[PDB]
Coordinates of C-alpha atoms and ligand atoms in Angstrom, one line a residue:
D1 CA -23.2 -86.5 -80.0
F2 CA -21.6 -89.9 -80.9
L3 CA -18.3 -88.7 -79.2
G4 CA -20.2 -87.5 -76.1
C5 CA -22.0 -90.9 -75.9
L6 CA -18.7 -92.8 -76.2
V7 CA -16.6 -90.7 -73.7
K8 CA -19.2 -91.3 -70.9
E9 CA -18.1 -95.0 -70.8
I10 CA -14.8 -95.0 -72.7
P11 CA -11.6 -93.0 -71.8
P12 CA -10.8 -90.2 -74.3
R13 CA -7.4 -92.1 -74.7
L14 CA -9.2 -94.8 -76.8
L15 CA -11.3 -92.5 -79.1
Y16 CA -9.7 -91.2 -82.3
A17 CA -11.7 -88.7 -84.3
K18 CA -11.0 -88.6 -88.1
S19 CA -9.7 -85.0 -87.5
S20 CA -7.3 -86.2 -84.8
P21 CA -3.5 -85.9 -85.4
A22 CA -3.2 -89.5 -83.9
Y23 CA -5.9 -90.9 -86.2
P24 CA -3.9 -91.6 -89.4
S25 CA -1.3 -93.7 -87.6
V26 CA -4.0 -95.7 -85.7
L27 CA -5.9 -96.2 -89.0
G28 CA -2.7 -97.3 -90.9
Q29 CA -1.1 -99.4 -88.2
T30 CA -2.6 -102.8 -89.3
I31 CA -3.5 -102.0 -93.0
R32 CA -1.8 -104.8 -94.9
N33 CA -2.7 -103.8 -98.5
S34 CA -1.4 -100.5 -100.0
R35 CA -4.4 -100.4 -102.3
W36 CA -6.6 -99.6 -99.2
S37 CA -4.4 -97.1 -97.3
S38 CA -4.4 -94.3 -99.9
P39 CA -6.5 -91.2 -99.4
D40 CA -9.2 -92.2 -102.0
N41 CA -10.4 -95.0 -99.7
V42 CA -13.5 -94.3 -97.6
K43 CA -12.4 -93.6 -94.0
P44 CA -14.1 -94.2 -90.7
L45 CA -15.6 -91.2 -88.8
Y46 CA -14.1 -92.6 -85.5
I47 CA -11.8 -95.4 -84.4
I48 CA -12.4 -96.8 -81.0
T49 CA -9.6 -98.9 -79.4
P50 CA -11.2 -100.8 -76.4
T51 CA -9.0 -102.3 -73.7
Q52 CA -11.9 -104.2 -71.9
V53 CA -15.2 -105.7 -72.9
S54 CA -17.4 -102.9 -71.6
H55 CA -15.8 -100.5 -74.1
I56 CA -17.0 -102.8 -76.9
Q57 CA -20.5 -103.0 -75.4
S58 CA -20.7 -99.2 -74.9
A59 CA -19.5 -98.5 -78.5
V60 CA -22.2 -100.8 -79.8
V61 CA -25.0 -99.3 -77.7
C62 CA -23.8 -95.9 -78.8
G63 CA -23.5 -97.1 -82.4
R64 CA -27.1 -98.3 -82.3
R65 CA -28.4 -95.2 -80.6
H66 CA -26.7 -92.8 -83.0
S67 CA -27.1 -94.9 -86.2
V68 CA -23.3 -95.4 -86.7
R69 CA -22.5 -98.8 -88.0
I70 CA -19.3 -100.5 -86.8
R71 CA -16.7 -102.5 -88.7
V72 CA -14.6 -104.5 -86.3
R73 CA -10.9 -104.9 -86.9
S74 CA -8.5 -107.3 -85.3
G75 CA -5.3 -108.0 -87.3
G76 CA -6.3 -105.8 -90.3
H77 CA -5.5 -108.6 -92.9
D78 CA -9.0 -108.5 -94.7
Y79 CA -8.0 -108.9 -98.4
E80 CA -10.5 -106.1 -99.3
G81 CA -9.8 -104.0 -96.2
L82 CA -13.5 -104.4 -95.1
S83 CA -12.4 -104.2 -91.5
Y84 CA -11.4 -100.5 -91.9
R85 CA -12.8 -99.2 -95.2
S86 CA -16.1 -99.2 -97.0
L87 CA -16.3 -99.4 -100.8
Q88 CA -18.7 -96.5 -101.2
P89 CA -19.1 -93.4 -99.0
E90 CA -20.7 -94.4 -95.7
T91 CA -20.6 -93.3 -92.1
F92 CA -19.0 -95.9 -89.8
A93 CA -16.7 -96.4 -86.9
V94 CA -14.0 -98.9 -86.6
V95 CA -13.8 -100.9 -83.4
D96 CA -10.1 -101.8 -83.4
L97 CA -9.3 -104.6 -81.0
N98 CA -5.5 -104.5 -81.2
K99 CA -5.0 -103.6 -77.5
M100 CA -6.9 -106.6 -76.3
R101 CA -4.3 -109.2 -77.1
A102 CA -4.4 -111.4 -73.9
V103 CA -3.7 -115.1 -74.2
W104 CA -4.3 -117.3 -71.1
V105 CA -3.1 -120.8 -71.5
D106 CA -4.4 -123.7 -69.3
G107 CA -1.6 -126.2 -70.1
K108 CA -3.1 -128.8 -67.8
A109 CA -6.7 -128.7 -69.3
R110 CA -5.1 -128.1 -72.8
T111 CA -7.4 -125.1 -73.4
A112 CA -6.6 -121.4 -73.9
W113 CA -8.5 -118.1 -74.0
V114 CA -7.3 -115.8 -76.6
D115 CA -8.5 -112.2 -77.3
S116 CA -9.4 -111.5 -80.9
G117 CA -6.9 -108.6 -81.0
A118 CA -4.0 -111.0 -80.5
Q119 CA -2.2 -112.0 -83.6
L120 CA -1.5 -115.6 -84.4
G121 CA 2.2 -115.2 -83.5
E122 CA 1.2 -114.1 -80.0
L123 CA -1.2 -117.1 -79.6
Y124 CA 1.4 -119.5 -80.9
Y125 CA 4.1 -118.1 -78.7
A126 CA 1.9 -118.3 -75.5
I127 CA 1.1 -122.0 -76.3
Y128 CA 4.8 -122.8 -76.6
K129 CA 5.5 -121.0 -73.3
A130 CA 2.9 -123.3 -71.7
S131 CA 4.2 -126.5 -73.4
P132 CA 6.7 -127.6 -76.1
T133 CA 4.3 -130.3 -77.2
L134 CA 1.1 -128.3 -77.7
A135 CA -0.1 -126.4 -80.7
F136 CA -3.1 -124.8 -82.3
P137 CA -4.1 -125.2 -86.0
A138 CA -4.5 -121.7 -87.5
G139 CA -2.9 -119.5 -90.2
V140 CA 0.6 -119.5 -91.5
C141 CA 1.2 -115.6 -91.3
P142 CA 2.0 -114.6 -87.7
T143 CA 0.5 -111.1 -88.0
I144 CA -3.0 -112.4 -88.9
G145 CA -5.5 -111.4 -86.2
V146 CA -7.2 -114.1 -84.2
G147 CA -10.6 -112.4 -84.7
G148 CA -10.8 -112.5 -88.5
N149 CA -8.8 -115.8 -88.8
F150 CA -11.1 -117.8 -86.6
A151 CA -14.4 -116.1 -87.7
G152 CA -13.7 -117.1 -91.4
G153 CA -12.4 -120.6 -90.5
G154 CA -8.6 -120.4 -90.4
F155 CA -6.2 -123.0 -91.8
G156 CA -2.5 -123.7 -92.1
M157 CA 0.2 -126.3 -91.8
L158 CA -1.8 -128.4 -89.3
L159 CA -5.1 -128.5 -91.3
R160 CA -4.6 -132.1 -92.4
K161 CA -4.0 -133.2 -88.8
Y162 CA -6.6 -131.1 -87.0
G163 CA -8.8 -129.3 -89.5
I164 CA -9.5 -125.5 -89.3
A165 CA -9.1 -123.2 -86.3
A166 CA -12.9 -122.6 -86.0
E167 CA -13.7 -126.3 -85.5
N168 CA -11.3 -126.3 -82.5
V169 CA -13.0 -123.4 -80.7
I170 CA -14.9 -124.6 -77.6
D171 CA -16.4 -121.3 -76.4
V172 CA -16.4 -117.5 -77.2
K173 CA -17.1 -114.2 -75.5
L174 CA -19.2 -112.1 -78.0
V175 CA -21.0 -108.8 -78.1
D176 CA -24.2 -108.9 -80.1
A177 CA -26.0 -106.1 -82.1
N178 CA -27.6 -105.0 -78.9
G179 CA -24.4 -104.7 -76.9
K180 CA -25.3 -107.8 -75.0
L181 CA -22.5 -110.0 -73.8
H182 CA -22.8 -113.8 -74.8
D183 CA -21.0 -117.0 -74.4
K184 CA -21.7 -120.3 -76.2
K185 CA -24.5 -121.2 -73.8
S186 CA -26.4 -117.9 -73.9
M187 CA -26.0 -117.4 -77.7
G188 CA -27.3 -120.9 -78.5
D189 CA -26.2 -123.6 -81.0
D190 CA -27.0 -121.7 -84.2
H191 CA -25.2 -118.5 -83.3
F192 CA -22.2 -120.5 -82.0
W193 CA -22.1 -122.7 -85.1
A194 CA -22.2 -119.5 -87.4
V195 CA -19.6 -117.5 -85.6
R196 CA -17.0 -120.3 -85.9
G197 CA -16.3 -120.1 -89.6
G198 CA -19.3 -118.2 -91.1
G199 CA -17.2 -115.1 -91.8
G200 CA -16.1 -112.0 -89.8
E201 CA -18.4 -109.1 -88.8
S202 CA -21.8 -110.8 -89.7
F203 CA -22.5 -112.4 -86.3
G204 CA -21.2 -109.8 -83.9
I205 CA -17.9 -108.9 -82.3
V206 CA -16.1 -111.8 -80.8
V207 CA -14.1 -110.5 -77.9
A208 CA -12.2 -113.7 -77.1
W209 CA -12.2 -117.4 -78.2
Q210 CA -11.6 -120.4 -76.0
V211 CA -9.7 -123.1 -77.9
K212 CA -8.7 -126.7 -77.4
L213 CA -4.9 -127.2 -77.6
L214 CA -3.7 -130.2 -79.5
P215 CA -0.6 -132.4 -79.3
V216 CA 2.5 -132.1 -81.4
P217 CA 5.7 -134.0 -81.1
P218 CA 8.7 -132.2 -79.5
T219 CA 10.4 -132.4 -82.9
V220 CA 8.7 -131.7 -86.3
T221 CA 10.4 -131.8 -89.7
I222 CA 10.2 -129.1 -92.4
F223 CA 11.4 -129.3 -95.9
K224 CA 11.4 -126.8 -98.8
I225 CA 12.3 -128.4 -102.1
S226 CA 12.2 -126.4 -105.3
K227 CA 11.6 -127.9 -108.8
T228 CA 11.7 -126.1 -112.2
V229 CA 10.0 -127.8 -115.1
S230 CA 13.3 -129.3 -116.4
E231 CA 13.9 -130.7 -112.9
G232 CA 10.5 -132.5 -113.3
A233 CA 7.9 -130.0 -111.8
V234 CA 5.1 -131.0 -114.2
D235 CA 5.2 -134.7 -113.4
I236 CA 5.9 -134.2 -109.7
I237 CA 2.9 -131.8 -109.4
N238 CA 0.7 -134.2 -111.5
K239 CA 1.5 -136.9 -108.9
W240 CA 1.2 -134.6 -105.9
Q241 CA -2.4 -133.8 -106.6
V242 CA -3.4 -137.4 -106.1
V243 CA -0.8 -138.4 -103.5
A244 CA -0.7 -135.4 -101.1
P245 CA -4.4 -135.5 -100.1
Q246 CA -4.0 -139.2 -99.3
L247 CA -0.8 -139.0 -97.3
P248 CA -0.9 -139.8 -93.5
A249 CA -2.4 -136.9 -91.4
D250 CA 1.0 -136.2 -89.9
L251 CA 2.3 -135.0 -93.3
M252 CA 1.3 -131.9 -95.2
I253 CA 3.0 -130.8 -98.4
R254 CA 1.9 -127.5 -99.7
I255 CA 3.2 -125.9 -102.9
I256 CA 4.3 -122.3 -103.6
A257 CA 4.7 -121.7 -107.3
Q258 CA 6.1 -118.5 -108.7
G259 CA 7.8 -117.9 -112.1
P260 CA 9.9 -120.9 -113.1
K261 CA 9.7 -122.9 -109.8
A262 CA 7.3 -124.8 -107.6
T263 CA 8.5 -125.1 -104.0
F264 CA 7.1 -128.1 -102.1
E265 CA 7.0 -127.1 -98.5
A266 CA 6.3 -129.8 -96.0
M267 CA 5.5 -129.9 -92.3
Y268 CA 5.7 -133.4 -90.9
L269 CA 4.7 -134.2 -87.3
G270 CA 7.7 -136.5 -86.8
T271 CA 11.4 -137.0 -87.4
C272 CA 13.6 -137.1 -90.6
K273 CA 14.1 -140.8 -89.7
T274 CA 10.5 -141.7 -90.4
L275 CA 9.9 -139.0 -93.0
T276 CA 12.6 -140.3 -95.3
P277 CA 11.1 -143.8 -96.0
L278 CA 7.6 -142.4 -96.1
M279 CA 8.6 -140.0 -98.9
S280 CA 10.6 -142.5 -100.9
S281 CA 7.7 -144.9 -100.6
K282 CA 4.7 -142.6 -101.3
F283 CA 6.1 -139.6 -103.1
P284 CA 9.4 -140.7 -104.7
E285 CA 9.0 -138.2 -107.6
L286 CA 10.1 -135.4 -105.3
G287 CA 13.6 -136.9 -104.6
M288 CA 13.4 -136.0 -100.9
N289 CA 16.5 -137.1 -98.9
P290 CA 17.7 -136.6 -95.3
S291 CA 19.7 -133.5 -96.4
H292 CA 16.4 -131.7 -97.1
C293 CA 15.2 -132.2 -93.5
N294 CA 15.0 -129.3 -91.0
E295 CA 14.1 -130.7 -87.5
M296 CA 12.9 -128.1 -85.0
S297 CA 10.1 -127.5 -82.5
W298 CA 6.6 -126.7 -83.7
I299 CA 6.9 -123.1 -82.5
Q300 CA 10.1 -122.8 -84.5
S301 CA 8.3 -124.0 -87.6
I302 CA 6.1 -120.9 -87.7
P303 CA 8.8 -118.4 -88.6
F304 CA 10.5 -121.1 -90.6
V305 CA 7.6 -122.0 -92.8
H306 CA 6.5 -118.4 -93.5
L307 CA 9.8 -116.5 -93.7
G308 CA 12.6 -119.1 -93.7
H309 CA 13.9 -117.6 -90.4
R310 CA 15.7 -119.7 -87.8
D311 CA 16.7 -117.3 -85.0
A312 CA 14.4 -114.4 -84.6
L313 CA 11.6 -116.3 -82.8
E314 CA 10.2 -113.4 -80.6
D315 CA 10.7 -110.8 -83.4
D316 CA 8.9 -112.9 -86.0
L317 CA 5.9 -113.9 -83.8
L318 CA 5.6 -110.9 -81.5
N319 CA 6.6 -107.8 -83.6
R320 CA 3.7 -105.5 -84.4
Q321 CA 5.6 -103.1 -86.6
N322 CA 3.8 -103.7 -90.0
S323 CA 6.3 -103.0 -92.8
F324 CA 4.8 -105.5 -95.3
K325 CA 2.2 -103.6 -97.2
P326 CA 2.2 -104.7 -100.9
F327 CA -0.5 -103.6 -103.3
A328 CA -2.3 -107.0 -103.5
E329 CA -5.0 -108.9 -105.3
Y330 CA -6.2 -112.4 -104.2
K331 CA -8.5 -115.2 -105.5
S332 CA -9.0 -118.8 -104.6
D333 CA -10.4 -122.1 -105.9
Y334 CA -11.1 -125.6 -104.7
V335 CA -10.2 -128.7 -106.7
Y336 CA -12.2 -132.0 -106.4
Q337 CA -10.9 -133.9 -109.5
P338 CA -7.3 -134.3 -110.7
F339 CA -6.2 -131.8 -113.3
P340 CA -5.1 -133.3 -116.6
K341 CA -1.4 -133.3 -117.0
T342 CA -1.7 -130.8 -119.9
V343 CA -3.3 -128.3 -117.4
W344 CA -0.3 -128.4 -115.2
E345 CA 1.8 -128.0 -118.3
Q346 CA -0.2 -124.8 -119.2
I347 CA 0.1 -123.5 -115.6
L348 CA 3.8 -124.0 -115.2
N349 CA 4.9 -123.4 -118.8
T350 CA 2.7 -120.5 -119.8
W351 CA 0.6 -118.9 -117.0
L352 CA 3.2 -118.6 -114.2
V353 CA 5.7 -116.8 -116.6
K354 CA 3.3 -114.4 -118.4
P355 CA 3.6 -110.6 -117.9
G356 CA 1.9 -109.8 -114.5
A357 CA 2.0 -113.4 -113.2
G358 CA 1.4 -113.9 -109.5
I359 CA 2.1 -116.7 -107.0
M360 CA 0.0 -119.8 -106.8
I361 CA -0.3 -121.6 -103.4
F362 CA -1.6 -125.1 -103.3
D363 CA -2.7 -126.7 -100.0
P364 CA -3.7 -130.4 -100.0
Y365 CA -6.8 -131.4 -98.0
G366 CA -8.0 -135.0 -97.2
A367 CA -7.4 -136.5 -93.7
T368 CA -9.0 -134.6 -90.8
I369 CA -10.2 -131.4 -92.6
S370 CA -12.1 -133.6 -95.2
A371 CA -13.3 -136.1 -92.5
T372 CA -15.4 -133.4 -90.8
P373 CA -19.0 -133.4 -92.2
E374 CA -19.6 -130.5 -94.6
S375 CA -22.5 -129.0 -92.6
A376 CA -20.7 -129.5 -89.2
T377 CA -19.3 -126.0 -89.5
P378 CA -20.0 -123.2 -92.0
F379 CA -16.7 -124.1 -93.8
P380 CA -17.9 -126.6 -96.5
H381 CA -14.8 -127.4 -98.5
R382 CA -14.2 -130.8 -97.0
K383 CA -15.1 -134.3 -98.3
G384 CA -13.6 -135.0 -101.7
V385 CA -11.5 -131.8 -101.8
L386 CA -8.0 -132.5 -103.3
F387 CA -6.6 -129.1 -102.8
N388 CA -7.2 -125.4 -102.4
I389 CA -5.6 -122.9 -104.7
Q390 CA -4.7 -119.3 -103.8
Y391 CA -3.8 -116.9 -106.5
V392 CA -1.7 -114.1 -105.0
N393 CA -0.7 -110.9 -106.9
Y394 CA 1.6 -108.4 -105.4
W395 CA 2.8 -105.1 -106.8
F396 CA 4.7 -102.2 -105.3
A397 CA 3.9 -99.0 -107.0
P398 CA 0.4 -97.5 -107.4
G399 CA 0.6 -97.3 -111.3
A400 CA 1.8 -101.0 -111.7
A401 CA -1.7 -102.6 -111.1
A402 CA -2.8 -103.2 -114.7
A403 CA -0.8 -106.3 -115.6
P404 CA -1.3 -108.3 -112.3
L405 CA -5.0 -107.5 -112.2
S406 CA -5.4 -108.6 -115.8
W407 CA -3.4 -111.9 -115.1
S408 CA -5.5 -112.6 -112.0
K409 CA -8.8 -112.3 -114.1
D410 CA -7.4 -114.3 -117.1
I411 CA -6.1 -117.1 -115.0
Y412 CA -9.4 -117.5 -113.0
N413 CA -11.2 -117.7 -116.4
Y414 CA -8.7 -120.3 -117.7
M415 CA -9.0 -122.5 -114.5
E416 CA -12.8 -122.5 -114.6
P417 CA -13.3 -125.9 -116.3
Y418 CA -10.9 -127.7 -113.9
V419 CA -12.0 -126.4 -110.5
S420 CA -15.3 -126.8 -108.5
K421 CA -18.4 -125.6 -110.2
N422 CA -22.0 -124.6 -109.5
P423 CA -21.0 -123.0 -107.1
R424 CA -17.3 -122.3 -107.8
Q425 CA -16.1 -122.6 -104.2
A426 CA -13.8 -120.0 -102.6
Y427 CA -12.4 -119.7 -99.1
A428 CA -14.1 -116.9 -97.0
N429 CA -10.8 -115.7 -95.5
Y430 CA -9.4 -115.3 -99.0
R431 CA -11.9 -112.5 -99.5
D432 CA -12.5 -111.6 -103.1
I433 CA -15.1 -108.9 -103.8
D434 CA -15.3 -109.8 -107.5
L435 CA -17.2 -113.0 -106.5
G436 CA -20.1 -110.7 -105.8
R437 CA -21.3 -108.2 -103.3
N438 CA -24.5 -107.3 -101.4
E439 CA -27.3 -105.1 -102.6
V440 CA -28.8 -103.1 -99.7
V441 CA -32.6 -102.5 -99.8
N442 CA -34.3 -100.5 -97.0
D443 CA -30.9 -100.5 -95.2
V444 CA -30.8 -104.3 -95.1
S445 CA -28.5 -106.6 -97.3
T446 CA -30.7 -108.8 -99.6
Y447 CA -30.7 -112.6 -99.3
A448 CA -30.8 -112.8 -103.1
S449 CA -27.6 -110.8 -103.6
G450 CA -25.8 -112.4 -100.7
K451 CA -26.5 -115.9 -102.0
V452 CA -24.3 -115.3 -105.1
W453 CA -21.0 -114.9 -103.3
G454 CA -22.4 -116.7 -100.2
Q455 CA -22.8 -120.1 -101.8
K456 CA -19.2 -119.9 -103.1
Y457 CA -17.8 -119.4 -99.6
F458 CA -20.2 -121.5 -97.7
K459 CA -22.1 -123.8 -100.2
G460 CA -25.0 -125.6 -98.5
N461 CA -24.3 -123.8 -95.2
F462 CA -25.2 -120.3 -96.6
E463 CA -28.8 -120.9 -95.8
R464 CA -28.4 -121.8 -92.1
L465 CA -26.0 -118.8 -91.9
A466 CA -28.7 -116.4 -93.2
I467 CA -31.5 -117.8 -91.0
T468 CA -29.1 -117.5 -88.0
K469 CA -28.3 -113.9 -89.1
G470 CA -32.1 -113.2 -89.3
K471 CA -32.4 -114.3 -85.6
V472 CA -29.4 -112.6 -84.1
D473 CA -29.2 -109.4 -86.2
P474 CA -32.5 -108.8 -88.1
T475 CA -31.8 -105.1 -88.8
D476 CA -28.4 -106.0 -90.3
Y477 CA -26.4 -103.7 -88.0
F478 CA -23.2 -105.6 -88.2
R479 CA -22.5 -105.7 -91.9
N480 CA -20.3 -105.0 -94.8
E481 CA -20.3 -105.4 -98.6
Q482 CA -20.0 -109.2 -98.3
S483 CA -21.5 -110.1 -95.0
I484 CA -24.3 -112.6 -94.3
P485 CA -27.8 -111.1 -95.2
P486 CA -30.7 -111.9 -92.8
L487 CA -33.3 -114.4 -93.9
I488 CA -36.2 -113.8 -91.6
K489 CA -39.2 -116.0 -90.9
Ligands
FDA501 C1 0.0 -112.2 -94.7 C2 -1.4 -112.9 -94.7 C3 -1.3 -114.3 -94.7 C4 -2.5 -115.1 -94.7 C5 -3.8 -114.4 -94.6 C6 -3.8 -113.0 -94.6 C7 -2.6 -112.3 -94.6 C8 -2.7 -110.8 -94.5 N1 -5.0 -115.2 -94.7 C9 -6.3 -114.6 -94.6 C10 -6.8 -114.2 -93.2 O1 -7.2 -115.4 -92.5 C11 -8.0 -113.2 -93.4 O2 -7.5 -112.0 -94.1 C12 -8.6 -112.9 -92.0 O3 -10.0 -112.6 -92.2 C13 -7.8 -111.8 -91.4 O4 -8.2 -111.6 -90.0 P1 -7.7 -110.3 -89.3 O5 -8.3 -110.2 -87.9 O6 -6.2 -110.2 -89.5 O7 -8.3 -109.2 -90.3 P2 -9.4 -108.0 -90.1 O8 -9.3 -107.3 -88.7 O9 -9.3 -107.2 -91.3 O10 -10.9 -108.8 -90.2 C14 -11.3 -109.6 -91.3 C15 -12.8 -109.7 -91.3 O11 -13.2 -110.3 -90.0 C16 -14.0 -109.3 -89.3 N2 -13.5 -109.3 -87.8 C17 -12.3 -108.9 -87.4 N3 -12.2 -109.1 -86.0 C18 -13.4 -109.6 -85.6 C19 -14.0 -110.0 -84.4 N4 -13.3 -109.9 -83.3 N5 -15.2 -110.5 -84.4 C20 -16.0 -110.6 -85.5 N6 -15.5 -110.3 -86.7 C21 -14.2 -109.8 -86.8 C22 -13.7 -107.9 -89.9 O12 -14.7 -107.0 -89.8 C23 -13.4 -108.3 -91.4 O13 -14.7 -108.4 -92.0 C24 -4.8 -116.5 -94.2 N7 -5.9 -117.2 -93.8 C25 -5.7 -118.5 -93.4 O14 -6.7 -119.1 -93.0 N8 -4.5 -119.1 -93.4 C26 -3.4 -118.5 -93.8 O15 -2.2 -119.1 -93.8 C27 -3.5 -117.2 -94.3 N9 -2.4 -116.5 -94.8
NA502 NA1 -9.5 -108.3 -104.3

């Protein structure tokens, strides 16, 4: 009867039963992790692909009426696949927002409305079409969905200049657990605060986000400078941890470290001419010179930073043919105090070259991201943060998991004394189920279980998130294994 309920309001075109011949390709289209696409993963009973907001409301009403929970999917990047799989057998539908990819840019007001189903590449491209001197601070990977990226916070190469995506959202269109359509005004301050950074799923289905668009110069400068240990990587990184978080807001230098080399990748909101003396003055250890400069427009920096590409702009931002589906494991940490130089020695000399070693990505904070009060948004990793670490393990055959998974665990153990503690902070969008998962009692996720992983992602904000959840979704309709549990008065 679920199908009959849906088809009353939604075209058959947009309803994919699990038995449907079209269902496997719709399911797989935006799966980004080969661990979660294989037949042993728990599959949704139905996938619904709305093209307008009433289809979302209808699906929710139908879901409530027929006791079918919904997991919403935008770009499909969830590290645990929680947008399209459950961990244990469960009946659920996926509401897959991929056909709702509209981006309307008001270049004059410097605001834009973007559907959650858009990918970052489509958002970024539409901004560029409106103006060569406007930008929006979200993720690095162009295939990330707006929905998940904004709901969990969202950060990238502009985080030092403008903070996270979520703190630059000025309104939303959202469907709640009752199928009611909300904006900022009708949902109220608590719900609007929660939705912008408090994690995907928990607070309802965001249909579209209104954002403020921010200035960038017509030319930005990117560099990618690699250092092995004999070229000085240990001393350069030992300096970087102090220097990079204190650099002017216009300069962000992230690190990608894999095997024998650390690649220092910078985006500077300016020219080589001003970048050169700044580097020689503030970060001379890197040996940056004008030859390392790549001047281009902001929009051009997106494929450049992520892929190294210089002339497939539309392909890199706009292509929706997946084709990158590693088996992948991810973890993250936040660092508040400088590592001893000997820890960098262990990381670069032993950890990164062990069997199963992954990639370590280091993003420096400070400036704007750290200026924002910790409780101002649900994202708490702000004042005092030196840098974020992401531990990324890829493998490419189903039987090759043992070594990377073991390295991932062992390194997280090794790093424990040097990273944040009590709670050990982690970024919500770097979803890591090993941080803890919910217990469900009487069909409702418990506060006590949610608190364990919840304080890691959201620290002191977890409480306001759970109280908000209690008000907007007391029966815990919109949930997953690591979603905000209701705390009800
Ligand atoms: C290649 C690549 C690169 C990166 C990243 C991922 C990947 C795959 N990440 C992490 C990314 O931000 C995280 O996986 C997001 O939650 C993904 O959002 P999607 O919509 O793509 O995923 P997906 O559709 O799987 O959703 C993720 C979670 O949000 C919920 N959700 C999705 N749409 C929603 C909606 N409309 N309303 C409410 N909830 C919704 C889902 O139910 C799920 O729980 C990231 N992050 C980052 O900040 N900066 C970065 O540079 C990167 N880099
Ligand atoms: Na994982």
